[PDB]
Enzyme design. Structure first.
Site, PDB file in Angstrom:
ATOM      1  N   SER A 221      87.561 -13.563 -43.390  1.00 44.60           N
ATOM      2  CA  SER A 221      87.250 -14.461 -42.267  1.00 44.60           C
ATOM      3  C   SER A 221      88.051 -14.029 -41.039  1.00 44.60           C
ATOM      4  O   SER A 221      87.783 -12.932 -40.514  1.00 44.60           O
ATOM      5  CB  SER A 221      87.467 -15.907 -42.745  1.00 44.60           C
ATOM      6  OG  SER A 221      86.944 -16.851 -41.813  1.00 44.60           O
ATOM      7  N   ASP A 244      83.559 -11.259 -45.375  1.00 43.86           N
ATOM      8  CA  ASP A 244      82.968 -12.300 -44.527  1.00 43.86           C
ATOM      9  C   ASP A 244      83.726 -12.442 -43.205  1.00 43.86           C
ATOM     10  O   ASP A 244      84.217 -13.514 -42.851  1.00 43.86           O
ATOM     11  CB  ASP A 244      82.932 -13.640 -45.271  1.00 43.86           C
ATOM     12  CG  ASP A 244      81.556 -14.302 -45.237  1.00 43.86           C
ATOM     13  OD1 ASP A 244      80.564 -13.652 -44.843  1.00 43.86           O
ATOM     14  OD2 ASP A 244      81.462 -15.481 -45.642  1.00 43.86           O
ATOM     15  N   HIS A 299      81.163 -19.202 -47.670  1.00 45.36           N
ATOM     16  CA  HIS A 299      82.320 -18.555 -47.045  1.00 45.36           C
ATOM     17  C   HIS A 299      83.544 -18.566 -47.950  1.00 45.36           C
ATOM     18  O   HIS A 299      84.268 -17.566 -48.060  1.00 45.36           O
ATOM     19  CB  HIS A 299      82.641 -19.267 -45.731  1.00 45.36           C
ATOM     20  CG  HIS A 299      83.516 -18.480 -44.805  1.00 45.36           C
ATOM     21  ND1 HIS A 299      83.284 -17.153 -44.511  1.00 45.36           N
ATOM     22  CD2 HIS A 299      84.612 -18.841 -44.095  1.00 45.36           C
ATOM     23  CE1 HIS A 299      84.193 -16.732 -43.644  1.00 45.36           C
ATOM     24  NE2 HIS A 299      85.008 -17.740 -43.369  1.00 45.36           N
TER      25      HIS A 299
HETATM   26  N1  8U9 Z   1      90.952 -21.588 -50.532  1.00 43.07           N
HETATM   27  C1  8U9 Z   1      91.050 -21.781 -49.410  1.00 43.07           C
HETATM   28  C2  8U9 Z   1      91.113 -22.061 -48.002  1.00 43.07           C
HETATM   29  C3  8U9 Z   1      90.772 -21.068 -47.075  1.00 43.07           C
HETATM   30  C4  8U9 Z   1      90.837 -21.331 -45.708  1.00 43.07           C
HETATM   31  N2  8U9 Z   1      90.499 -20.314 -44.776  1.00 43.07           N
HETATM   32  S1  8U9 Z   1      88.986 -19.715 -44.660  1.00 43.07           S
HETATM   33  O1  8U9 Z   1      88.442 -19.648 -45.978  1.00 43.07           O
HETATM   34  O2  8U9 Z   1      89.027 -18.544 -43.845  1.00 43.07           O
HETATM   35  C5  8U9 Z   1      88.113 -20.938 -43.756  1.00 43.07           C
HETATM   36  C6  8U9 Z   1      87.915 -20.774 -42.395  1.00 43.07           C
HETATM   37  C7  8U9 Z   1      87.240 -21.746 -41.683  1.00 43.07           C
HETATM   38  C8  8U9 Z   1      86.770 -22.884 -42.321  1.00 43.07           C
HETATM   39  C9  8U9 Z   1      86.048 -23.943 -41.547  1.00 43.07           C
HETATM   40  O3  8U9 Z   1      85.864 -23.748 -40.335  1.00 43.07           O
HETATM   41  O4  8U9 Z   1      85.682 -24.960 -42.163  1.00 43.07           O
HETATM   42  C10 8U9 Z   1      86.991 -23.043 -43.681  1.00 43.07           C
HETATM   43  C11 8U9 Z   1      87.657 -22.071 -44.407  1.00 43.07           C
HETATM   44  C12 8U9 Z   1      91.272 -22.571 -45.269  1.00 43.07           C
HETATM   45  C13 8U9 Z   1      91.611 -23.558 -46.176  1.00 43.07           C
HETATM   46  C14 8U9 Z   1      91.536 -23.317 -47.544  1.00 43.07           C
HETATM   47  O5  8U9 Z   1      91.887 -24.286 -48.484  1.00 43.07           O
HETATM   48  C15 8U9 Z   1      91.044 -25.378 -48.682  1.00 43.07           C
HETATM   49  C16 8U9 Z   1      89.753 -25.398 -48.208  1.00 43.07           C
HETATM   50  C17 8U9 Z   1      88.966 -26.518 -48.436  1.00 43.07           C
HETATM   51  C18 8U9 Z   1      89.479 -27.611 -49.117  1.00 43.07           C
HETATM   52 CL1  8U9 Z   1      88.428 -28.990 -49.379  1.00 43.07          CL
HETATM   53  C19 8U9 Z   1      90.786 -27.590 -49.597  1.00 43.07           C
HETATM   54  C20 8U9 Z   1      91.373 -28.751 -50.346  1.00 43.07           C
HETATM   55  F1  8U9 Z   1      91.278 -29.893 -49.672  1.00 43.07           F
HETATM   56  F2  8U9 Z   1      90.777 -28.965 -51.510  1.00 43.07           F
HETATM   57  F3  8U9 Z   1      92.658 -28.578 -50.618  1.00 43.07           F
HETATM   58  C21 8U9 Z   1      91.563 -26.462 -49.357  1.00 43.07           C
END
Ligand code: 8U9
Length: 372
Positions: A221, A244, A299
């Site tokens: 990303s 990605d 993603h």
């Molecule tokens: N594994 C990883 C992870 C990875 C990323 N960076 S990324 O993948 O580059 C990315 C970039 C942008 C966006 C968007 O613009 O939305 C999203 C993702 C950020 C948080 C993460 O951690 C959780 C992600 C979702 C949730 Cl629900 C939780 C939780 F709440 F469960 F702890 C943790």
């Protein structure tokens, strides 16, 4: 136990952290490496409560959700031997890995552990550009001795700030990838380093452990854009794999200044034309560029939380796609290993997966669904 998959390769995997120097301008990374011993798979996945607070802030919630995440995930392990001795007698190729927005150094352990299990050392950098959900550093040496951490949390941007600040961040991220490489290479050739973290892994073991011609940068990303910026600036990196990539941070000048081979591994459901067109700007008949798209993925199939929940809650949170998360990460990891063998000149059996670089699998699309 944990649902983060063990590495598929024949090496057992160790893990430790390295911070040097101790300041906000020093290098901070999590190392995955081939280990001498396979005693016990005890690495803590998310090691401090403040990372959970940072994730809640990134997700738009408050401190109550941070504590809920900590309750759910604060003792989860990832399958690596914490502080296990490095396996001696071999020089290992090296990957520097760059995390996405709102992540931090420990959230790509499924990739890092699989690479290390195939005989790589992996340095997953923690960026200090305020793109990580959280990170920390020390204001002086005494604070580092005491464990008196200074925390730095994700910066939210006004729309008017996005173009400038994201490009400033990608330039800092590339500098941090090049600085982390220099730290490891300097340790490899005997630079004395005092880890700002007191850990039972002696960094002197890393002396004469790196195959210095076989260096790659990989990132997801924001980290995929960081791969491209880093390759443009630092020719010690001999090839890059962008998982990605989010291309928005990159300035127009980089697209013509990447001599090294470059591999784009995309998810099916993340990409869009304005992003893909910048990937196509990297293509040129004098350079090697390959692209595959993983059918049915989202993603976050590249990041560890794709393994941390059940199938239905994961799908609702967009942590999981239509494809099984283990099937998706295996395809990304195997295609990566084949590309690394080809362009680093490894003498392994990773070329058994050369067909994946061409997208030749029921769960792969050659190129992209975005025809632009
Ligand atoms: N594994 C990883 C992870 C990875 C990323 N960076 S990324 O993948 O580059 C990315 C970039 C942008 C966006 C968007 O613009 O939305 C999203 C993702 C950020 C948080 C993460 O951690 C959780 C992600 C979702 C949730 Cl629900 C939780 C939780 F709440 F469960 F702890 C943790």
């Amino acid at each position: 136990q944990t649902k983060i998959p063990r590495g598929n390769g024949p090496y057992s995997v160790g893990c430790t952290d390295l911070m040097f120097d101790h300041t906000n301008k020093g290098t901070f990374l999590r190392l995955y490496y081939p280990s001498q011993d396979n005693d016990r798979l005890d690495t803590l996945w998310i090691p401090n409560k403040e990372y959970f607070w940072g994730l809640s802030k990134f997700l738009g919630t408050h401190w109550l959700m941070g504590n809920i995440l900590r309750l759910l995930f604060g003792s989860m392990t990832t399958p690596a031997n914490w502080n296990s001795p490095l396996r001696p007698g071999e020089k290992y190729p090296l990957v520097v890995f760059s995390h996405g927005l709102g992540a931090f150094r420990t959230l790509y352990s499924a990739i890092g552990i699989d690479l290390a299990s195939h005989g790589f050392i992996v340095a997953a950098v923690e960026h200090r550009d305020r793109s990580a959900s959280a990170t920390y550093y020390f204001k002086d040496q005494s604070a580092a001795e005491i464990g008196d951490k200074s925390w730095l949390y994700l910066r939210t941007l006004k729309q008017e700030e996005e173009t400038h600040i994201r490009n400033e961040q990608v330039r800092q991220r590339a500098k941090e990838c090049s600085q982390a490489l220099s730290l490891i290479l300097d340790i490899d050739h005997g630079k004395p380093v005092k880890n700002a973290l007191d850990l039972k892994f002696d960094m002197e073991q890393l002396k004469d452990s790196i195959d210095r011609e076989k260096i790659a940068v990989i990132g997801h990303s924001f980290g995929g854009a960081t791969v491209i910026q880093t390759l443009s600036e630092d020719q010690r990196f001999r090839c890059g794999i962008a998982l990605d990539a989010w291309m928005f941070p990159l300035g127009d000048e980089v697209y013509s200044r990447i001599p090294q081979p470059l591999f784009f591994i995309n998810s099916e459901y993340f990409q869009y034309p304005a992003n893909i067109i910048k990937m196509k700007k990297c293509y040129s008949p004098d350079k090697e560029r390959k692209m595959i798209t993983i059918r049915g993925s989202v993603h976050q199939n590249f990041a560890d939380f794709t393994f941390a929940t059940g199938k239905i809650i994961g799908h609702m949170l967009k942590l999981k796609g239509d494809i099984d998360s283990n099937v998706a990460i295996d395809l990304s990891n195997k295609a990566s290993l084949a590309f690394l063998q080809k362009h680093l000149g490894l003498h392994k059996d990773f070329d058994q997966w050369d067909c994946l670089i061409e997208g030749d699998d029921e769960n792969l699309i050659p190129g992209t669904n975005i025809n632009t």
